[PDB]
């Protein structure tokens, strides 16, 4: 029950064809479903009338089948356009869109051939083993406010560090990972600390 979409498409096409073949063997109000017997039993006017009724019914069945095939083809075309977009933006590159190529942070993708479709194996990065920390919007030092460059201020309880958002790699707060953009009277939640000067 993992390849349900392709199997469903194949089953729908086979069911449509079988329904068309069965519907070929429908009377549609005529004397018989076979034309040779109709010609043999009836005179040319009545046989022509019954044959004409059968023609109308069978053509109506063909119109319904063709319309269903066109609608299914539109759906399959939309799915194929989506698959081409996924192949382009996830196999030929890394996609920043959320959940377009799997849950979590997308890393890469690998396509695999299928009988009437494609299978994408999305390799993604999923964070785990979470831990609590105490933050602050900025660090107050020498009457100035320091904000992280590409990280965040956290504290394990006694000391403050700068770590990247998606992984816990604490580092000493220096001037090489923080920038100064004002004083300590406008930022809400600032905390007094020292900033290392290398």
């Amino acid at each position: 029950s993992a390849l349900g979409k392709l199997q469903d498409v194949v089953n729908q096409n086979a069911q449509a064809l079988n329904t068309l073949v069965k519907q070929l063997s429908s009377n549609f109000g005529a004397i018989s479903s076979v034309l040779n017997d109709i010609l043999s039993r009836l005179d040319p006017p009545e046989a022509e009338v019954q044959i004409d009724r059968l023609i109308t019914g069978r053509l109506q069945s063909l119109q319904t089948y063709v319309t269903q095939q066109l609608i299914r083809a539109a759906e399959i075309r939309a799915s194929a356009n989506l698959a081409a977009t996924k192949m382009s933006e996830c196999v030929l590159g890394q996609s920043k869109r959320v959940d377009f190529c799997g849950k979590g942070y997308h890393l890469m993708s690998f396509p695999q051939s299928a009988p009437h479709g494609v299978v994408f194996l999305h390799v993604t990065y999923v964070p785990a083993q979470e831990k609590n920390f105490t933050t602050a919007p900025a660090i107050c030092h020498d009457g100035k406010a320091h904000f992280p460059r590409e990280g965040v201020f956290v504290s394990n309880g006694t000391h403050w560090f700068v770590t990247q958002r998606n992984f816990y790699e604490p580092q000493i707060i220096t001037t090489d990972n923080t920038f100064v953009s004002g004083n300590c009277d406008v930022v809400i939640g600032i905390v007094n600390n020292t900033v290392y000067d290398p």
């Binding site: 399959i76 996924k86 799997g102 299978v119 993604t124």
Partner: protein
Amino acid sequence: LTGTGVLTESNKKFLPFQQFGRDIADTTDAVRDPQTLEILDITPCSFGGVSVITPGTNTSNQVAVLYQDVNCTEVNVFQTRAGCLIGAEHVNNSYECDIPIGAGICASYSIIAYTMSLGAENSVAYSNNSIAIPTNFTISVTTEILPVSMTKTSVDCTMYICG
């Protein structure tokens, strides 16, 4: 005019020259009986769809029968917004929807019927000076199946029709 349905008392007041009342889109709604000149509302007797809720013959042969949009007082018995259910025992718990019946009601295998659980309820420990940071990670491979094409079929109508 010959119809079929149930007759009931109607609070609508007609006009003396008016015999019967037609509902919107030209369907009969009420007819006044000529004998005592009383307004009687006519609505068709209950009809619906019969559905079967089953865990599949591989597991068990026990089934539950659902009558769609039918009040089963005139046909265990349970009443849902989707109709009436017979053969399923209602429970007060909540699990993941196994067999979707409708209107927030799902059945699972005896056959039980319950209200579907939207998911595990958890409260995030939000605070104005607290963060959660992951110290580890996992590499997850997810499989996505996308159809690309169907079988190409051609029909020769001239010979398809009658050979």
